[PDB]
Amino acid sequence: EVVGGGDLGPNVLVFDPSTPDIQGKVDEVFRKQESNQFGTDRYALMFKPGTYNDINAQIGFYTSIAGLGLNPDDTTFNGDVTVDAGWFDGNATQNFWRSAENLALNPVNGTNRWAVSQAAPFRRMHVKGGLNLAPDGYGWASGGYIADSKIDGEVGPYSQQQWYTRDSSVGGWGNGVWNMTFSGVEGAPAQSFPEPPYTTLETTPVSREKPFLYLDGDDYKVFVPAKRTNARGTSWGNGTPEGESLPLDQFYVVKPGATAETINAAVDQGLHLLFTPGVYHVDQPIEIDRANTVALGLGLATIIPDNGVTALKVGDVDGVKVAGLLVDAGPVNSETLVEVGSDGASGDHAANPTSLQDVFVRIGGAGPGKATTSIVVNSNDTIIDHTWVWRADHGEGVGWETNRADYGVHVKGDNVLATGLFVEHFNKYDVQWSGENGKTIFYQNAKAYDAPDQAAIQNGDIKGYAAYKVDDSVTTHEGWGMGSYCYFNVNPDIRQQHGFQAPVKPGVKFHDLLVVSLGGKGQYEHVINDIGDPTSGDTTIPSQVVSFP
Numbered sequence: 001e002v003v004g005g006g007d008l009g010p011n012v013l014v015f016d017p018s019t020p021d022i023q024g025k026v027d028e029v030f031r032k033q034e035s036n037q038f039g040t041d042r043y044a045l046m047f048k049p050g051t052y053n054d055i056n057a058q059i060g061f062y063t064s065i066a067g068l069g070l071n072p073d074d075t076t077f078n079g080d081v082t083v084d085a086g087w088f089d090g091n092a093t094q095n096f097w098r099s100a101e102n103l104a105l106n107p108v109n110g111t112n113r114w115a116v117s118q119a120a121p122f123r124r125m126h127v128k129g130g131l132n133l134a135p136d137g138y139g140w141a142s143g144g145y146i147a148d149s150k151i152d153g154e155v156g157p158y159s160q161q162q163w164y165t166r167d168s169s170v171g172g173w174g175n176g177v178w179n180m181t182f183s184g185v186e187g188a189p190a191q192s193f194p195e196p197p198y199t200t201l202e203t204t205p206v207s208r209e210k211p212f213l214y215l216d217g218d219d220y221k222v223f224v225p226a227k228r229t230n231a232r233g234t235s236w237g238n239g240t241p242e243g244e245s246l247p248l249d250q251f252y253v254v255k256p257g258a259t260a261e262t263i264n265a266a267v268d269q270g271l272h273l274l275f276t277p278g279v280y281h282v283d284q285p286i287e288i289d290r291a292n293t294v295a296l297g298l299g300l301a302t303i304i305p306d307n308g309v310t311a312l313k314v315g316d317v318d319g320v321k322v323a324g325l326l327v328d329a330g331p332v333n334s335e336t337l338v339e340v341g342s343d344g345a346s347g348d349h350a351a352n353p354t355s356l357q358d359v360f361v362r363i364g365g366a367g368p369g370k371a372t373t374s375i376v377v378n379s380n381d382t383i384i385d386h387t388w389v390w391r392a393d394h395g396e397g398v399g400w401e402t403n404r405a406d407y408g409v410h411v412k413g414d415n416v417l418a419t420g421l422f423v424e425h426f427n428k429y430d431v432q433w434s435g436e437n438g439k440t441i442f443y444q445n446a447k448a449y450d451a452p453d454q455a456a457i458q459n460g461d462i463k464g465y466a467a468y469k470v471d472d473s474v475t476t477h478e479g480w481g482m483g484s485y486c487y488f489n490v491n492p493d494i495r496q497q498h499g500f501q502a503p504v505k506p507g508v509k510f511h512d513l514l515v516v517s518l519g520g521k522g523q524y525e526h527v528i529n530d531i532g533d534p535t536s537g538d539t540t541i542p543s544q545v546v547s548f549p
């Protein structure tokens, strides 16, 4: 019944080197999207292989930009892919929900500026120059994520609080502020936490590059990279990348108007899913219960579950690849927003795991939204490679009860790996880990700002809920480069007992932990459990623990 392939729709703007007035067209999109933080418009900018001149592609909200070559250098800009913070007067901490992928950049002054905060991935890029991650003026910034990229020159974070880079090559790295973490990065600074705060791993235990749309001659296909174990450096640096190409006609091209019934029928009939840029309400969960199904979003394609349903349920199958989607809570509380595997799921998926990549979750902000637990990861061996799970702290429909969301991520599966984990503002535990042999490389949290009083976050005999909790029953766990920040601005007398909570066991280990009070608005009593100094003063100095236990 469901037909594969077809037109990508009016929200995918496709350019070729002969297209007239590319700069004008990209500027038109930017003018509309620059300060459109919570609007429903969505755009994907796609560039056919070739060389583009005189281009400064400024990237606003809900805008993806990418090349369509098999390799990044197939699509080269003499010019820039720019994010700056002019619209927010130099403050980059709301520069969300945008992306760059699969381009080579020759920046006009020798340095490309990508001054982003959360949910702004930078993947499979070749920067023939330096990369500045800070807004002009060096104002506030809270990114960030680079994967599978080569920066010929220096990456300069400047004011960036923290950053995660994996499986990349850099010519240099300028500085660290609170938490700069690296895994598999050629050219990374050596391990040196706490000063500078560099957490450096020689390899990434497992990684699998995100699938992406490209052109094979004149035919659209999706490239599906093969997994790497103990990954280091780029996947494409040595020519022909390992992987499979799926023709576009094997994808159901989802466009505004599609129902979950039709989307589900497509997967049952053997089609993959390509979500064109838009906002999709569903009255029942999208169910992906076929092995190796790709569900790929363009232009920050967004799913809103109506009637309190779960937005996305992946079955107990190998190799599902969910990529580039925003799940946006409806005002009716959803018990869960995303489920990976069934409750009690018991099989292994080690050779061909399921992954979530550039999957973002929002609760509130564009109107009231509620969910009890945002992502539940049941399936063993699942890879979570860049997520931002965010209870809104600002916008419309925000409040301690108005956009209540108790739990961010709950990992129940075994051998689950999170690389680039960003989870913020939940009323209770932002992350809870119940499964065995979990690993997290890079964590960024901020606690809820709007707790009205101490009683509101009382957790048995503990003040507050950890940002990252490993259940007492767990035997093996390991985390690297992890920070939790507080800003109790509604009630700055509040105390948060710790950022992290875990059993004290030989196989449960942490490296380079920190907690930070932002401007003395509340304080931490400890870093992890009852260990580590409290934060003090109003000067935003981190409290650190190098090794636990």
Ligand SMILES: OC[C@H]1O[C@@H](O[C@@H]2[C@@H](O)[C@H](O[C@@H]3[C@@H](O)[C@H](O)O[C@H](CO)[C@H]3O)O[C@H](CO)[C@H]2O)[C@H](O)[C@@H](O)[C@@H]1O
Residues within 6 Å of the ligand: 056, 080, 082, 083, 084, 085, 086, 087, 089, 090, 108, 109, 111, 112, 113, 136
């Ligand atoms: O010419 C290439 C050059 O482009 C720069 O992109 C700039 C923006 O940085 C600049 O942003 C301004 C902010 O810095 C300032 O804080 O506020 C004002 C007003 O909102 C902003 O305009 O805006 C211009 C367009 O007006 C862009 O061209 C890149 O940052 C830089 O890396 C690159 O070399």
Ligand SMILES: OC[C@H]1O[C@@H](O[C@@H]2[C@@H](O)[C@H](O[C@@H]3[C@@H](O)[C@H](O)O[C@H](CO)[C@H]3O)O[C@H](CO)[C@H]2O)[C@H](O)[C@@H](O)[C@@H]1O
Residues within 6 Å of the ligand: 093, 094, 140, 141, 142, 161, 393, 394, 424, 446, 487, 518, 519, 539, 540
């Ligand atoms: O509220 C918008 C956005 O805020 C993000 O967190 C910001 C912090 O990034 C910011 O941190 C400042 C540091 O960047 C700077 O170096 O030091 C100052 C103190 O001198 C810090 O305040 O602080 C503000 C509060 O003032 C926070 O809101 C969140 O990560 C994000 O979720 C949120 O949407």
